[PDB]
Amino acid sequence: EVQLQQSGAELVKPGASVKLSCTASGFNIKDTYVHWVKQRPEQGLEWIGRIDPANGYTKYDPKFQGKATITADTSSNTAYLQLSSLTSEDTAVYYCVRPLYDYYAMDYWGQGTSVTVSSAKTTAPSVYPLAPVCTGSSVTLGCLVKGYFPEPVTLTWNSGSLSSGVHTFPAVLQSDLYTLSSSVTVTSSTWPSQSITCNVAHPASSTKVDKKIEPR
Amino acid sequence: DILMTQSPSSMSVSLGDTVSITCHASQGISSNIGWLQQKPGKSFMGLIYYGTNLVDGVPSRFSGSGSGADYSLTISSLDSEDFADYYCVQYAQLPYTFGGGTKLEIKRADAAPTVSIFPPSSEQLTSGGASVVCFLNNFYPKDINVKWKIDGSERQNGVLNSWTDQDSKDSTYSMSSTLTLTKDEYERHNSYTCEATHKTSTSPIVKSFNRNEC
Amino acid sequence: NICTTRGVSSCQQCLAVSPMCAWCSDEALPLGSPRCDLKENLLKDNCAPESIEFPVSEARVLEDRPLSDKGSGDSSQVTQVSPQRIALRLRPDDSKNFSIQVRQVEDYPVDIYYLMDLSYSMKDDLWSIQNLGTKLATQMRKLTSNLRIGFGAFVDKPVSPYMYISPPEALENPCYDMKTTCLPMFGYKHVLTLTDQVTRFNEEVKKQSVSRNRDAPEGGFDAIMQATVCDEKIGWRNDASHLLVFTTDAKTHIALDGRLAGIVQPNDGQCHVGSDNHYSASTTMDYPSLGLMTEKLSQKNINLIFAVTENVVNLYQNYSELIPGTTVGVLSMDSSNVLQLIVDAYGKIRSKVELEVRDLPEELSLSFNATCLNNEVIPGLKSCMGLKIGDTVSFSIEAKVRGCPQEKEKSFTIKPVGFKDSLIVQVTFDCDCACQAQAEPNSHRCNNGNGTFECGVCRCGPGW
Amino acid sequence: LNLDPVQLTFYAGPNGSQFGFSLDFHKDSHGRVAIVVGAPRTLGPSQEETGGVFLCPWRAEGGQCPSLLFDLRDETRNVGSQTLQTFKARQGLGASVVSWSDVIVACAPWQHWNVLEKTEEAEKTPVGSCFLAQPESGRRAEYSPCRGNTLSRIYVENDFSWDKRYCEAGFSSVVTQAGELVLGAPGGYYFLGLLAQAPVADIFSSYRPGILLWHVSSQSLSFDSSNPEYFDGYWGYSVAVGEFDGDLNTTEYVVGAPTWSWTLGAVEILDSYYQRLHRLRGEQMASYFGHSVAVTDVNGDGRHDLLVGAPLYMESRADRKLAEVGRVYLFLQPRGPHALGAPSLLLTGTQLYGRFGSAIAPLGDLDRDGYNDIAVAAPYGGPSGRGQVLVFLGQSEGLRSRPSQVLDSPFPTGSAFGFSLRGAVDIDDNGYPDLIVGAYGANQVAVYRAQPVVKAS
Ligand SMILES: *[C@@H]1O[C@H](CO)[C@@H](O[C@@H]2O[C@H](CO)[C@@H](O[C@@H]3O[C@H](CO[C@H]4O[C@H](CO)[C@@H](O)[C@H](O)[C@@H]4O)[C@@H](O)[C@H](O[C@H]4O[C@H](CO)[C@@H](O)[C@H](O)[C@@H]4O)[C@@H]3O)[C@H](O)[C@H]2NC(C)=O)[C@H](O)[C@H]1NC(C)=O
Ligand SMILES: *[C@@H]1O[C@H](CO)[C@@H](O[C@@H]2O[C@H](CO)[C@@H](O)[C@H](O)[C@H]2NC(C)=O)[C@H](O)[C@H]1NC(C)=O
Ligand SMILES: *[C@@H]1O[C@H](CO)[C@@H](O)[C@H](O)[C@H]1NC(C)=O
Ligand SMILES: [Ca+2]
Ligand SMILES: [Ca+2]
Ligand SMILES: [Ca+2]
Ligand SMILES: [Ca+2]
Ligand SMILES: [Cl-]
Ligand SMILES: [Mn+2]
Ligand SMILES: [Mn+2]
Ligand SMILES: [Mn+2]
């Protein structure tokens, strides 16, 4: 079965270079064209270029000329995408693609390789409890993880105990650092009677703080 | 470069429905078009190639049609797995260009947001910062607008918003707005408010609190 | 002797016993005297001299023109074989010997048709030979006073995939994708009919130019066939040595190759060069086979010379072995040595004499003793080699008839390969008796009418 | 021996169509035998020659046959900033046909192809192409392994390596028992010749109309070479399959290269990865040794034997003279892992220019004596030069050196009677294997039915 295994998430500094790989599984990389595609949430999908691993001939979208360099090593059944002089805009997810039957199509895709370009050094998160203001039948608490890098962070309540009725929002990049928050809802008879704790772990800095929510 | 105008950008539909996503190119591409599926938080799967040809393994409820510069992906009898992102791609000319995309979302009954506001923590304040959080939970449709007010006057600088994807078993959306100020600036004012504007209510749902008071 | 101890019944059966036997038809022959005995024993028994039937095998010449010293002048009254005709007479199981002289006459006319590969790699070659006509004339003048020369050229079948067929520009100028111009592709074209006006050769050659095609093997064999069977157009002369000079630096297409261009029709060995001087069946008829080429070359008495570059010399030497009479010479990469190559080939061609027999009766068998170099007799040999122009050789020949054939009159030919003249041998089988032509059917002597009386004895009539 | 030359069956195609150039037996899903016939000069839609295929139902009286329809229109695809073009004029569809299971494969070796990109091009060249059909269902597919999208300049810069532009794929063809199509392409790699193989199942499942350039991942092509012995060798002029390495799980290929090694000619036996197991060399230059090959066990030991035709072989005759008559060579496969030796038997033609050995057909066991038999064609043989087919019977020591039977052409001069042959199938179901003979020059096919033996040999 055709499978394209791409390399792991990359995290580099601006002005540097990175080389992504795409290893063919269940077939010979030499068989077809190999394309590279860039995906960003706002800008969407962009075609970088293609290569014919058999002979090494490449094509690029002029937008990426100089920035991207595509190569291949049939010996290791791998295709590569080298990016140079990286910047913030080069932060995106990258895919390698090949056709099924049609020579020119785009049918099989690798799982994708996330690339993040930041100057930020490894920073531990600041966890802040969010208790309501000094009333209803249901109460809502919260947790605020601010100023950490890089991603990700695992957030749970009462150590995975309180599961249902929770909303952990996607992290957002606050000037070179990330911010995330989570809301949880229960009945008035559950809090502050039942102790609720916010559990945040940041494998990067190897820290795992825990903040209990206190009323006012 | 050929431009691929894909529509609609999104649609709210239900299981069993027959929907159609169209694609218009800035010139003729003689069926040299493919259709792609991206399930939430996953990679891409090929659906169609050369206009009408199903990729191996793809159910027949998917079909493609069109000619010249106008094409369509059609999904008869929507399945639970069919709710995802769909993109068109042309390969008539280099460079290959993609459509803007289309997200199929689950349709449900309107629902108002549960708004909650949270003043800065003691911990953060003693550090020199001040974040006011505002949770707008479990609402539908997704089109919502938040507005921060300090002492009655709107505030735009220092606001970070974050949205969740359509929740699994209730099909609602949630939002998180956070206003961050310096300790000093946070103490220059007294009243803090966030106004939620949803199609559900003609009047904005408001939630406030007052510093130096509780 | 064997004549008497055989107990023959007739004069015919007597002569068929042995060539030494005779028959006596005399009436007054003693009681128990054998009518079939040695001619000496018969006369010893008072046998009338006129009653002796004793045929003797002989071989007298009917035409014996002397060999020519020069092949110049004349409208072909040159003799290079002698005698030209002899009458042979043989009796049952007998034999008789005769001789034949063959001369490589000096100053014999020569036709040289230059057949040139004109694919792109022969461009420099074409520049080298623009004075070959006059330079060749100068050297051949030393050997002959009747030289004619001509010129033809070939590339390959003008059809895909041998020919470039795109873009349209490539059809008019196959060299378009390079930075030059060349002729559209052509299979074979006749350029200059054999003529003694040698500057016509120089001037025709100076107007020639190369073309270009895709695959390495070329269509020369097509051109050899046409150059051979298009007699009037090429202009071969009846009385002249015919030299077909084939120059190329590449491999050659052969019969059955044509199927790569969708051509399956076998070569018909016929002329297909019309008034436009191009080979019109080039794109509809397959390349010729070695066998068919050999048949036509031999039929038209053409001496094919492979003048090819060292990279393909072995190839053409190996073909040469399958086409007897062909000679090979090493051509330089620009044909700068082709002149001496042709002169040496000509000498090599006229350095051999090989006898060939045609229309020989089944009953007759021949044996040969050759005399070459210097009166050196070489038994069981009918071909001489290492000869020079002007030299003369001879062969002793013996004919041995087996039994006596139904037909009494037969003739056959002995001709050296490539030669115009030949020895016609008119054979006559003498196994009858002169007295048979005056027999007595239903004779009163033979069983009273039931028999025939001939040659002295009584034979049983027809029907019994 | 026992083919009936008195009551023949004749099938006929249009005049000038060359109907009978190639043929084969075809069995439908029910076991009903028909005859597929190629006619590579049949007129197409634009009143221009494109070739065609006919599927003749069996009938003792013969007659006309219905067409097996294929798309004859030229195609254009503008894609990837390039223009793909097929050209079907004079493509010779039906220059080869083969049947396997209920599928028919008919090839057009001279179909041309070109790719345009701005002012550049690949060059318009005969890549050849094959058309596949499943007559009963109507399914159609194509296979053209030599089509490429590389521009002319790239070949020049790379010294014309791996140049498949003049393949003429389908020039010869054969299908393995497992259903792998093997195409001979004598023009491949700048006229060295190559082989292309792919499973029929995968050819059908990967083909879609309009694509023109598509991938058949399970396919396998042979290799280019730097050895001058192979230059202009037309490797793939003829192809066949058989068992020659003792391992029944593997299928071996037999490939003819009639002009291999400066026209010496050769035949090679290869494994399915195109590795050479044996090489038989021609005996005489330009004899076209390898023009035709046949695989069949003739001496009843269960081991496949090889027959090679050299239609232009020149026999030595009195007075140092040579006579082109053609020749066939028999190689018996030895026991266990051993090399094929010298030929076990040499069959030589008698008629000048007869081209004995132009075609060789296994007949199965014609006379039912336990030994397989063969037919050899001499398309211009016979005392009248009209064409002859000779039958040779198998025996414990190989083949009989004298023909058991001779079939003289029933057609007029120039018919090329015998140019195509096929046997080993019982078409009338009388228990005896029959023989079909093509005469493309007369646009007809003759069916010879085997009958019970009169007096055995
Ligand atoms: C024109 O025609 C000539 C003559 O036929 C060809 O030359 C022959 O080419 C063949 C094939 O390469 C040669 O065959 C080889 O013979 C070798 C030994 O030969 C010896 O004895 C001869 C006697 O005449 C000598 O001339 C020669 O110099 C040697 O001393 C063998 O050792 C070779 O064996 C190898 O190959 C064979 C398969 O071919 C294998 O079976 C063996 O195991 C081994 O691998 C080989 O058999 C032959 O020697 C050549 N003959 C001559 C006289 O040179 C030309 O090739 C041909 N030219 C063209 C362009 O067509
Ligand atoms: C060819 O030469 C041979 C001798 O080499 C001749 O044979 C001899 O013929 C004479 C005739 O008187 C016999 O006496 C000898 O016995 C023969 N010798 C041998 C060795 O056979 C032969 O006659 C010659 N043939 C021709 C046609 O002239
Ligand atoms: C035959 O040979 C003899 C010598 O044995 C010779 O004298 C004679 O001239 C020859 N006969 C002829 C007619 O040549
Ligand atoms: Ca095997
Ligand atoms: Ca056997
Ligand atoms: Ca048998
Ligand atoms: Ca039968
Ligand atoms: Cl050239
Ligand atoms: Mn050339
Ligand atoms: Mn040169
Ligand atoms: Mn050529």
PDB file of C-alpha atoms and ligand atoms in Angstrom, chain C residues 120-125 249 332-335, ligand 10:
ATOM      1  CA  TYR C 120      25.498  13.816 -42.193  1.00  0.00           C
ATOM      2  CA  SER C 121      28.790  12.143 -41.180  1.00  0.00           C
ATOM      3  CA  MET C 122      29.781  12.000 -44.859  1.00  0.00           C
ATOM      4  CA  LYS C 123      29.817  15.788 -45.193  1.00  0.00           C
ATOM      5  CA  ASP C 124      33.619  16.006 -44.998  1.00  0.00           C
ATOM      6  CA  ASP C 125      33.922  13.028 -47.369  1.00  0.00           C
ATOM      7  CA  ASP C 249      30.918   4.623 -42.557  1.00  0.00           C
ATOM      8  CA  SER C 332      39.484   6.826 -44.328  1.00  0.00           C
ATOM      9  CA  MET C 333      37.073   8.925 -42.258  1.00  0.00           C
ATOM     10  CA  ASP C 334      36.982  11.554 -45.026  1.00  0.00           C
ATOM     11  CA  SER C 335      37.330   9.333 -48.116  1.00  0.00           C
TER      12      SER C 335
HETATM   13 MN    MN E  10      33.210  11.598 -42.618  1.00  0.00          MN
END
